Enzyme design. Structure first.
Site, PDB file in Angstrom:
ATOM      1  N   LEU A  17      82.281  -1.648  -0.569  1.00  0.00           N
ATOM      2  CA  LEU A  17      81.221  -0.790  -0.061  1.00  0.00           C
ATOM      3  C   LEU A  17      81.619  -0.224   1.321  1.00  0.00           C
ATOM      4  O   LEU A  17      81.504   0.974   1.566  1.00  0.00           O
ATOM      5  CB  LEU A  17      79.900  -1.582   0.029  1.00  0.00           C
ATOM      6  CG  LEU A  17      79.326  -2.049  -1.310  1.00  0.00           C
ATOM      7  CD1 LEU A  17      78.290  -3.148  -1.128  1.00  0.00           C
ATOM      8  CD2 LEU A  17      78.754  -0.884  -2.101  1.00  0.00           C
ATOM      9  N   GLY A  18      82.094  -1.093   2.198  1.00  0.00           N
ATOM     10  CA  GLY A  18      82.486  -0.696   3.538  1.00  0.00           C
ATOM     11  C   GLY A  18      83.049  -1.850   4.328  1.00  0.00           C
ATOM     12  O   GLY A  18      83.341  -2.909   3.768  1.00  0.00           O
ATOM     13  N   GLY A  19      83.235  -1.637   5.617  1.00  0.00           N
ATOM     14  CA  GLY A  19      83.807  -2.669   6.470  1.00  0.00           C
ATOM     15  C   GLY A  19      83.864  -2.292   7.925  1.00  0.00           C
ATOM     16  O   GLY A  19      83.837  -1.110   8.276  1.00  0.00           O
ATOM     17  N   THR A  21      83.968  -4.636  12.131  1.00  0.00           N
ATOM     18  CA  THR A  21      84.240  -5.865  12.886  1.00  0.00           C
ATOM     19  C   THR A  21      83.569  -7.105  12.260  1.00  0.00           C
ATOM     20  O   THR A  21      84.022  -8.232  12.496  1.00  0.00           O
ATOM     21  CB  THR A  21      83.799  -5.674  14.343  1.00  0.00           C
ATOM     22  OG1 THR A  21      82.437  -5.253  14.363  1.00  0.00           O
ATOM     23  CG2 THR A  21      84.662  -4.645  15.074  1.00  0.00           C
ATOM     24  N   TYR A  22      82.508  -6.899  11.467  1.00  0.00           N
ATOM     25  CA  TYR A  22      81.778  -7.968  10.771  1.00  0.00           C
ATOM     26  C   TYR A  22      82.489  -8.444   9.474  1.00  0.00           C
ATOM     27  O   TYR A  22      82.068  -9.438   8.888  1.00  0.00           O
ATOM     28  CB  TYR A  22      80.337  -7.524  10.444  1.00  0.00           C
ATOM     29  CG  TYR A  22      80.325  -6.217   9.688  1.00  0.00           C
ATOM     30  CD1 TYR A  22      80.464  -6.189   8.311  1.00  0.00           C
ATOM     31  CD2 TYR A  22      80.261  -5.001  10.360  1.00  0.00           C
ATOM     32  CE1 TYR A  22      80.552  -4.995   7.621  1.00  0.00           C
ATOM     33  CE2 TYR A  22      80.324  -3.798   9.675  1.00  0.00           C
ATOM     34  CZ  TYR A  22      80.445  -3.800   8.301  1.00  0.00           C
ATOM     35  OH  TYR A  22      80.535  -2.624   7.600  1.00  0.00           O
ATOM     36  N   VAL A  25      83.011  -5.655   3.096  1.00  0.00           N
ATOM     37  CA  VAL A  25      81.894  -5.917   2.199  1.00  0.00           C
ATOM     38  C   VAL A  25      82.072  -5.294   0.843  1.00  0.00           C
ATOM     39  O   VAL A  25      82.352  -4.107   0.738  1.00  0.00           O
ATOM     40  CB  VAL A  25      80.550  -5.506   2.845  1.00  0.00           C
ATOM     41  CG1 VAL A  25      79.389  -5.751   1.880  1.00  0.00           C
ATOM     42  CG2 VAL A  25      80.332  -6.251   4.162  1.00  0.00           C
ATOM     43  N   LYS A  40      81.041 -10.703   1.469  1.00  0.00           N
ATOM     44  CA  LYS A  40      81.633 -10.243   2.709  1.00  0.00           C
ATOM     45  C   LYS A  40      82.796 -11.130   3.083  1.00  0.00           C
ATOM     46  O   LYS A  40      82.599 -12.305   3.337  1.00  0.00           O
ATOM     47  CB  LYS A  40      80.564 -10.252   3.810  1.00  0.00           C
ATOM     48  CG  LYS A  40      81.073  -9.879   5.195  1.00  0.00           C
ATOM     49  CD  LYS A  40      79.882  -9.701   6.182  1.00  0.00           C
ATOM     50  CE  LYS A  40      78.973 -10.908   6.261  1.00  0.00           C
ATOM     51  NZ  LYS A  40      77.699 -10.602   6.980  1.00  0.00           N
ATOM     52  N   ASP A 131      73.271  -5.859  18.400  1.00  0.00           N
ATOM     53  CA  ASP A 131      73.940  -4.915  17.494  1.00  0.00           C
ATOM     54  C   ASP A 131      72.898  -4.096  16.734  1.00  0.00           C
ATOM     55  O   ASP A 131      73.155  -3.697  15.600  1.00  0.00           O
ATOM     56  CB  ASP A 131      74.849  -5.701  16.520  1.00  0.00           C
ATOM     57  CG  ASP A 131      75.916  -4.876  15.855  1.00  0.00           C
ATOM     58  OD1 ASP A 131      76.293  -3.832  16.426  1.00  0.00           O
ATOM     59  OD2 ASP A 131      76.369  -5.271  14.748  1.00  0.00           O
TER      60      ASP A 131
HETATM   61  C1  LIG Z   1      74.838  -1.278  -1.401  1.00  0.00           C
HETATM   62  C2  LIG Z   1      75.398  -0.760  -0.119  1.00  0.00           C
HETATM   63  N1  LIG Z   1      75.658   0.525   0.013  1.00  0.00           N
HETATM   64  N2  LIG Z   1      76.140   0.665   1.268  1.00  0.00           N
HETATM   65  C3  LIG Z   1      76.549   1.973   1.754  1.00  0.00           C
HETATM   66  C4  LIG Z   1      78.042   2.139   1.640  1.00  0.00           C
HETATM   67  F1  LIG Z   1      78.461   3.356   1.978  1.00  0.00           F
HETATM   68  F2  LIG Z   1      78.715   1.285   2.424  1.00  0.00           F
HETATM   69  F3  LIG Z   1      78.474   1.913   0.393  1.00  0.00           F
HETATM   70  C5  LIG Z   1      76.191  -0.509   1.918  1.00  0.00           C
HETATM   71  C6  LIG Z   1      75.716  -1.464   1.056  1.00  0.00           C
HETATM   72  N3  LIG Z   1      75.560  -2.828   1.208  1.00  0.00           N
HETATM   73  C7  LIG Z   1      75.922  -3.494   2.378  1.00  0.00           C
HETATM   74  N4  LIG Z   1      76.784  -2.891   3.203  1.00  0.00           N
HETATM   75  C8  LIG Z   1      77.129  -3.509   4.340  1.00  0.00           C
HETATM   76  C9  LIG Z   1      78.119  -2.760   5.185  1.00  0.00           C
HETATM   77  C10 LIG Z   1      79.409  -2.341   4.534  1.00  0.00           C
HETATM   78  C11 LIG Z   1      78.410  -1.314   4.888  1.00  0.00           C
HETATM   79  C12 LIG Z   1      76.577  -4.814   4.617  1.00  0.00           C
HETATM   80  C13 LIG Z   1      76.804  -5.634   5.839  1.00  0.00           C
HETATM   81  C14 LIG Z   1      77.009  -7.011   5.804  1.00  0.00           C
HETATM   82  N5  LIG Z   1      77.170  -7.776   6.888  1.00  0.00           N
HETATM   83  C15 LIG Z   1      77.090  -7.188   8.086  1.00  0.00           C
HETATM   84  C16 LIG Z   1      76.861  -5.838   8.217  1.00  0.00           C
HETATM   85  C17 LIG Z   1      76.692  -5.018   7.102  1.00  0.00           C
HETATM   86  N6  LIG Z   1      76.472  -3.702   7.491  1.00  0.00           N
HETATM   87  C18 LIG Z   1      76.508  -3.757   8.801  1.00  0.00           C
HETATM   88  N7  LIG Z   1      76.735  -4.999   9.304  1.00  0.00           N
HETATM   89  C19 LIG Z   1      76.835  -5.391  10.703  1.00  0.00           C
HETATM   90  N8  LIG Z   1      75.703  -5.395   3.783  1.00  0.00           N
HETATM   91  C20 LIG Z   1      75.381  -4.739   2.662  1.00  0.00           C
HETATM   92  C21 LIG Z   1      74.413  -5.447   1.742  1.00  0.00           C
HETATM   93  N9  LIG Z   1      74.031  -6.668   2.113  1.00  0.00           N
HETATM   94  O1  LIG Z   1      74.021  -4.913   0.701  1.00  0.00           O
END
Ligand code: A1ITB
Length: 287
Positions: A17-19, A21-22, A25, A40, A131
């Site tokens: 999905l993305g990535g 400093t955390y 993912v 993650k 953050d």
């Molecule tokens: C389902 C989906 N779509 N998108 C949009 C994208 F473009 F990335 F695909 C993003 C998600 N899901 C997540 N994405 C992220 C980040 C890669 C974008 C995180 C995440 C996890 N830990 C820390 C984080 C995170 N984000 C910021 N910080 C500081 N969690 C989830 C989730 N739990 O569904």
């Protein structure tokens, strides 16, 4: 609490999905239940012993709240810590507004109330998120609002890179945090300022001064006559929203209200703030 095995033994790994400093993912599916989850991957520092890692996973598990993305389990595999977390189907608020445009004032009010509930919980646990921004507030398919994590305080992984990241992108930090490497420290009230900036970001698609070089924003925020930012279009927003921005962006932390105090502000205590406002926002993605 932590499994000494490959996460792929219990989950099917899907798209990245993305990535940042955390960590990195990925979307993933539980092999038995079939439910969607987010995995993650966090690279570990070789100096952090398994006792240090266990202390941090215990915190990850006990620091729990409805407005923070839930932790499900962890795996130690090939010097990497894989964290299983609740899947938030609509991504971040930044992902949403970069398709839909500016959120409505009622949508921003609901987001702010939900984030304040999460911050009041983290502050009661003696943590500072440090953050808060639109990209770090995630939305699920039900319209529920969750902070992606409890902030920068995890004493595992790329902690230093996470902690110093705002120096290259300081738009959401309070002036006492922007006064980095000076004698004065800061406290949890820096999150309340970050929430005020996030409300402007949701209204305007970028935080104030986004177009300014990060080192110039740091220079401006430590000048004596620095004035807190405000919403650009006065007539577009109510007096309650302007006052919410005014008090969350109080320059002195000794005068800035707490997360609990903010929860009784007219903007976030008003009736009619519910996930249906965000369901309306998600409906805009289709068109
Ligand atoms: C389902 C989906 N779509 N998108 C949009 C994208 F473009 F990335 F695909 C993003 C998600 N899901 C997540 N994405 C992220 C980040 C890669 C974008 C995180 C995440 C996890 N830990 C820390 C984080 C995170 N984000 C910021 N910080 C500081 N969690 C989830 C989730 N739990 O569904």
């Amino acid at each position: 609490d932590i499994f000494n095995r490959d996460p792929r033994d219990h989950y099917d790994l899907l798209q990245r999905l993305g990535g940042g400093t955390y960590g990195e993912v990925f979307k993933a599916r539980d092999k038995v239940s079939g439910d969607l989850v987010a995995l993650k991957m966090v690279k570990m520092e070789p100096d952090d012993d398994v006792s240090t890692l266990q202390k941090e996973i215990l915190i990850l598990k006990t620091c729990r709240h409805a407005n923070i993305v839930a932790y499900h389990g962890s795996y130690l595999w090939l010097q990497k810590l894989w964290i299983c977390m609740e899947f938030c189907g609509a991504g971040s608020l930044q992902d949403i507004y970069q398709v839909t445009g500016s959120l409505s004032e009622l949508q921003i009010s609901y987001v702010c109330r939900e984030v304040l509930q999460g911050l009041a919980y983290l502050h009661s646990q003696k943590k500072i998120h440090r953050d808060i921004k639109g990209a770090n507030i995630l939305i699920n398919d039900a319209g529920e609002v969750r902070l992606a994590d409890f902030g920068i305080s995890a004493q595992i992984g790329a902690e230093l890179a996470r902690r110093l990241e705002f120096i290259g992108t300081p738009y959401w930090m309070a002036p006492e945090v922007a006064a980095v490497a000076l004698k004065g420290g800061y406290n949890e009230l820096c999150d309340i300022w970050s929430l005020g900036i996030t409300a402007i970001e949701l209204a305007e698609l970028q935080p104030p001064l986004f177009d300014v070089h990060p080192l110039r924003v740091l220079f401006l925020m430590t000048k004596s006559g620095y004035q807190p930012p405000r919403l650009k279009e006065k007539g577009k927003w109510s007096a309650a929203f302007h006052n919410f921005i005014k008090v969350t962006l109080t320059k002195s932390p000794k005068k800035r209200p707490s997360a609990t105090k903010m929860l009784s502000h007219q903007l976030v205590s008003q009736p009619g703030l519910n996930r249906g406002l965000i369901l309306d926002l998600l409906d805009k993605l289709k068109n």
